[PDB]
Design a protein around this ligand. Sequence first.
Ligand SMILES: O=C(O)[C@@](O)(COP(=O)(O)O)[C@H](O)[C@H](O)COP(=O)(O)O
Ligand SMILES: O=C(O)[C@@](O)(COP(=O)(O)O)[C@H](O)[C@H](O)COP(=O)(O)O
Ligand SMILES: O=C(O)[C@@](O)(COP(=O)(O)O)[C@H](O)[C@H](O)COP(=O)(O)O
Ligand SMILES: [Mg+2]
Ligand SMILES: [Mg+2]
Ligand SMILES: [Mg+2]
Ligand SMILES: [Mg+2]
Lengths: 467, 469, 356, 228, 126, 126
Amino acid sequence: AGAGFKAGVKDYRLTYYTPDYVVRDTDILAAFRMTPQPGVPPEECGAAVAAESSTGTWTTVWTDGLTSLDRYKGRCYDIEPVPGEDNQYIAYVAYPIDLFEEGSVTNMFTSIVGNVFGFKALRALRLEDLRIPPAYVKTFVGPPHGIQVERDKLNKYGRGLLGCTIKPKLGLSAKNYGRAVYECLRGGLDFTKDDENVNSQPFMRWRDRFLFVAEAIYKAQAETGEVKGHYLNATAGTCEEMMKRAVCAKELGVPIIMHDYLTGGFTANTSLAIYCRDNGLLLHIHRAMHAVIDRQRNHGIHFRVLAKALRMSGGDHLHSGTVVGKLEGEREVTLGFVDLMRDDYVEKDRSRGIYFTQDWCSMPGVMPVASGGIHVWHMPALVEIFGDDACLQFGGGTLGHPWGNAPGAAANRVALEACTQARNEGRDLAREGGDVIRSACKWSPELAAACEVWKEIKFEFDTIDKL
Amino acid sequence: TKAGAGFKAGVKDYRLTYYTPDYVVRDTDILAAFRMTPQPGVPPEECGAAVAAESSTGTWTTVWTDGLTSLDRYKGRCYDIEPVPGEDNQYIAYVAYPIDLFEEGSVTNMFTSIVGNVFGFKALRALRLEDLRIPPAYVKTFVGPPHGIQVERDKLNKYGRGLLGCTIKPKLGLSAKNYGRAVYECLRGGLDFTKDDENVNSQPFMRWRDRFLFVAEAIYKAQAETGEVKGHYLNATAGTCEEMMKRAVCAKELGVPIIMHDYLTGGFTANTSLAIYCRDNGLLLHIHRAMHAVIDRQRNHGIHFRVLAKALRMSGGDHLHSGTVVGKLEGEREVTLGFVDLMRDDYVEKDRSRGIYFTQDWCSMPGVMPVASGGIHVWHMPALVEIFGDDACLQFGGGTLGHPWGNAPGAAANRVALEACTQARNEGRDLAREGGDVIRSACKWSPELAAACEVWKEIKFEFDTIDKL
Amino acid sequence: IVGNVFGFKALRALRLEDLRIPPAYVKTFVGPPHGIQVERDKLNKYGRGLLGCTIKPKLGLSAKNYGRAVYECLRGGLDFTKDDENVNSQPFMRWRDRFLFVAEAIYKAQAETGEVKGHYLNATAGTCEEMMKRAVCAKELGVPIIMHDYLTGGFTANTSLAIYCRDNGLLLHIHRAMHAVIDRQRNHGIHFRVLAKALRMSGGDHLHSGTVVGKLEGEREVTLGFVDLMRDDYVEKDRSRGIYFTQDWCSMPGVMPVASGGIHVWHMPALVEIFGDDACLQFGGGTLGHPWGNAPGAAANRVALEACTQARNEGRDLAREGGDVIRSACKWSPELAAACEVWKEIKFEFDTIDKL
Amino acid sequence: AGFKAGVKDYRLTYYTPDYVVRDTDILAAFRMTPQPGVPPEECGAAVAAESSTGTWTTVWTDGLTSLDRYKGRCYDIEPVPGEDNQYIAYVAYPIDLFEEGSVTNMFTSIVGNVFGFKALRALRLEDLRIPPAYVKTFVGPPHGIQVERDKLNKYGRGLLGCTIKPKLGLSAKNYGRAVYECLRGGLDFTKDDENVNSQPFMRWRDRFLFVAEAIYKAQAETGEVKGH
Amino acid sequence: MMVWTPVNNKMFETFSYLPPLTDEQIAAQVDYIVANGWIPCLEFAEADKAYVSNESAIRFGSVSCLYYDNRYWTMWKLPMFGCRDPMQVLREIVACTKAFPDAYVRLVAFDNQKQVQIMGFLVQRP
Amino acid sequence: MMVWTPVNNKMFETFSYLPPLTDEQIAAQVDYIVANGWIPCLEFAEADKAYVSNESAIRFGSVSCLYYDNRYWTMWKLPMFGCRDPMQVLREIVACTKAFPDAYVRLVAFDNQKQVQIMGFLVQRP
Ligand SMILES: O=C(O)[C@@](O)(COP(=O)(O)O)[C@H](O)[C@H](O)COP(=O)(O)O
Ligand SMILES: O=C(O)[C@@](O)(COP(=O)(O)O)[C@H](O)[C@H](O)COP(=O)(O)O
Ligand SMILES: O=C(O)[C@@](O)(COP(=O)(O)O)[C@H](O)[C@H](O)COP(=O)(O)O
Ligand SMILES: [Mg+2]
Ligand SMILES: [Mg+2]
Ligand SMILES: [Mg+2]
Ligand SMILES: [Mg+2]
């Protein structure tokens, strides 16, 4: 009499709640914020999540006996109650490395977040963090270039990079796009970009835009003597259309394209990142749709996980939020995932939402892009939050300048350089920021015009995505 | 020579441009219904206008470039706002988007506008997209599903009953040859289909091409044995589009009928490409909705599944999981009946009692077969047939591989239960009232079914529903 | 020749009646993929007109119903069925679905009857790339014949497709959709004989020729003249048949004339008399409108054709005795009798517009 | 709804003068001249039938589908003033009848066979209503007027072109010579004659190369963008 | 545990896993056709043409996906358009099986709005 | 509205949009180098080699993406590994600019842990 096949249902906790498990250094770990239904204990909820993201279903199957379920099973190995909550728990789940397809963020998400969020036995579920072990990190191509290589190709050092989304979001012609781009770039911005939803449309077809934008890039570069780029959007309905757009950028010799990784998707994104590696194009990643997933504290996937996923799938830039602009991003939360995006090794730190120590094993860092509702008075705060390895983008903050795009660009560039110099001289941008900007507004007429228009504009609201 | 409207730098309320309550929507407009929860102090009109603006043409301060174009022609328009009864800070905001805003044939582009940035605005606390009106003029820009329900039934030569499938178990950890062994034993007992689990792609314990070959052997063995066309959804989901396409090509070259794709985790750009491939090479495409409940579970924030289902119909899929209502994963009856109609039918009238906010005209785009799967067993058969009717695939993974006598008897039990319920309905029996009696009689008759009936007799999944209307 | 001159203000009307294509220009064309002799040799079909049939309703049938209809037609004795000229790929029936179900039907009817069968699968498309994808699928299914709408698709695409068919062994049926926009009126346009020469040059194994007696116009002498221009190697000037120039085809293959449109069993003697054996006679409504269904409808047409062919070979004059030949066969074959009764009083006799 | 074999009038199925056209229907206006003894209603119905779903005798396969859904419909007929035997027949075609993005398919239905019917003496298609839902299935023009002006950098006046002459018979180098001299005097464009393709007196690739030289010479000389 | 035999256990789609349909049970299925306004039709095949097979794929390139021989059977007469009398359908079953006593015979029904077969089951096995 | 001139307005990356750095301001940047332990280095170029250009792309196929001539300038001596004295960095600035009075000269600093230039600005214009 050995263990035989026993048909029927049993608790998931009997197999998948294993609190004495010693996590392996190749295991993928997940931290889930779980809200059980009444009558379902946390250990059963955590075990259900582990089981149905790994090896298990709702009734016992005989085929388990042909393999080793202990070798492959996901394991809920720890549960902690959430402070301030009487029905939220953090469940920790360990996944053997054999469960995952090498180099596939798609596969990793399909297991860990594929079905478990819809279980009737839970009321809410949020994936807070993932520990991606070095042995799995090494299966990914990763980002095409990463921060150091990007600065080296651009020949740009010693300050944040400056970008700008062209406006109106939609409705401009290709030639007006290029006109706006030239005027922005020539005033001191390093980059402009297609809006995330500018792909190819009746009012402006993509290839027309790419050609006029190429003219604008090369005109502004020749005029200023600084390398310029414009993130041309390769986001498309199909992978063949996406690749056609990347090929056209390659053939025009321009430096940088963009992709909306969540609305295009990880399979297409990973393909595009590999193309960019093989053809030397920088790849800017827009996180369109992320807040559908990541806004609420009780349910979804925290942005830090979406950022890790993008680092793995591949991107030279990724939007990080601004903290102070029109879209939400609490300071400590943001500082934590910026480190996860940029750094090689990030220690556990629950005060910044870092549930696991993360070792990136030399995968290139991704440049954070702070964008959305920011203007010249936010410059000191942005430089203080991000430091030099960030791109700060001013769309309305450039195309809303009273004197037009070139003056608007110059205002942003002067502001950034004034903040950067002040910090280098030992000034505390957190205390002296307003004084730094005021002094620069006195000196530069272009900056002064921006300073006056946006002086009272602030975005200060109650935060939803709190730790 | 009095000056006309010019460029004035600075911030003004979004509602001055984007709240248009007297707008008459056009028949080509894409319409969105958002369940919006504004921050305290933000008027609903301004919050709705912000959502319209920042999903269409506007940003946070006035830009001079508007004057080069026509914002009247292009702007998104919040054209109606209705307070939600029972909610003191929740509104349905209706937004109309000109058809010119969208890239033809690109679900990716449509989502990038409507749900790209607005869910993260500090000025709202929560936002949920409940429905989209996809006008015929935009529907017609999509290839859509490879085949759709009628063509699928015609290719399989299968009529008069729900289709039956089954996910192979353990989810992960089986070898390629054991996968094919399990598949043969399942298919030969009366299931039409088996499938790769959504997360079975290619892994150390089982590489994809080995699986595809052994599964081909199993399909053809079970088909020859039973005389009924068989399939197994071979998973083409992959890390890169090139890998996805390699896997589809191998299925083509083996002559097998059906592959699957995880459209949300693989993504719309890859999914649309794969659907086009399947159309051009005659493969059925089963779509798994892995990750949907990350987005669609909560009432106050995210995107309702009905929109994710419309998006899949547009991007393309022959099957799409619909939920079961009665199984282990959530799906309320009325909600589910509504989006099943949106998946299958040509024309679906507005019906807020089933969560249908807009009349939807699919203008002859093929219907998508709803797949009811997850935590179901033989006692659920009457309810499943009553809910879905014949145009559905009912899948029993644990409910087949958990049968005490093995996969072939497990398959036979499910097939007998389905046919008994189908026959009973056809004879005029009301499955909602007589379902238990139908199953009890069939259990008496069939020993394979009786063994399933006994093991799962007390097993139900009855919990408080989160995604309520 | 026809690019700009028809619009000159200085003329009120202009019609191109004929073109003399010299041998030295004929020889620059690939021409038809196969031509009549090769087609008969590939099909192994000799000694009688070929029989075809357009599936009906023109539009609105599903792919599987298309194949069902095709199988039932082919199995009763038709050599061929065909997509309607406007059946390309549409919401009610996508092309590749149709191609696959039609393949099943062709092979089922061929195995059942022991006679080679085909169905003209339409490669007509919006773009050359889609046209070629459809031709490739036919090649890969091993089926014998595709079709193309040469005027609505256009000569550039037609010539490309003919070359593909030559290189891959596919018969190419040509439908003349739109021709009567150009060729109907006596005072203006281009006579069909020129459109037929142009098709012979661009390439086609079949071309519709009209029926004379059916629902679409085609006067006898006009039609006999351009049938010779389509099929023969050398056609002398003959203004009584509208042949303005002696035409030397310098061994370019002949094109099979296809008589189709509003014909039924009682027209069989006239059709055999007009065209002889080297024609395909097509009965769409005349098969799918038989009261007993497609197989009996096919058998009725096949019996009628064979009875007329046998009678002609035995010395009977089909111009005088045709009705007697059909009446005799009606009495013998129950399937033919049912067709004879339903369409006994149906004729198409109208004043001719395209007169010499 | 039984199958009844035999011929019946087209107007019993295809003349529907109270039909309300759908906003996705393709509409056609035909100037129709019936033969003597053929009522306009029957002629219009025959045009509708034989450009959509119908043939000359009743087919049983109609019953497997829905002819209501698919049939072309003659929905209005108006006599032409000044004409005693001309009518404008209006026909509505469901959008499902047409292959997306294919003008070829649209013409094959609407003008494929009906112009040759013995029952009419003459037929002219005067206009087509192409609904937005069908327009949107086409790629359409590569660029269109605004984009063309933007690429050429040419605004504020008509563009000026010129067909090179003799139509045929010029060599490639003489073609380029003529082109350079035309473009340099102020024309924006020159062009090959419609019948200049590739011929013994001038092969196309030779012409393309010499014309390229001429375009670039005239553009450098004038400072205005040139094309041929 | 009972073992499901793989030997001589071929099936014919809907209702093949139930006890053989009695005459009463067949008549009830015909009533369901008539109640829903569907179009009855009979189809038949000799034994050699009754089972799905693959022989035509010898002529193919790599395009066998969802191609099988013997899905089509032979139509008995025509679909019974306009038939709303179950006794007429039953009489045709008798006539078809009388004419082809050695054939497989199936009763199907068509829906012309979905344009698909909406029911079907075997009524005669040789 | 003031118009940003496009004529004779070439820039030199970090700090070009500020007023010309005073000697105190340059000294403060050298302090920041030393305080952070970065490796000072000077680079210089004649006027014809100072601005980004594209001439070498004549030799290329379609691989010009992020290739430009004149990003590299000429190294003055070696990076000042181990330098923790601002006097020594300012001394070399003088030395470099005296030796090449007609050249563009920039002061850069390297971080060897990121292995990247972490600061840089123009210290001399011809
Ligand atoms: O569409 C927009 O709103 C923007 O172009 C910014 O415009 P402004 O510069 O005019 O605000 C950016 O895409 C957002 O920053 C994205 O949000 P996030 O960075 O949070 O992903
Ligand atoms: O992984 C699983 O759990 C399943 O294989 C079902 O297993 P069982 O048949 O063994 O329950 C299906 O993928 C789920 O049905 C998906 O959920 P949904 O259909 O709701 O998208
Ligand atoms: O569409 C039709 O009407 C047909 O399919 C015939 O159908 P029936 O057999 O049912 O009449 C043929 O295409 C016409 O013969 C074409 O005209 P023509 O041959 O004169 O070019
Ligand atoms: Mg944007
Ligand atoms: Mg699964
Ligand atoms: Mg036709
Ligand atoms: Mg000309």
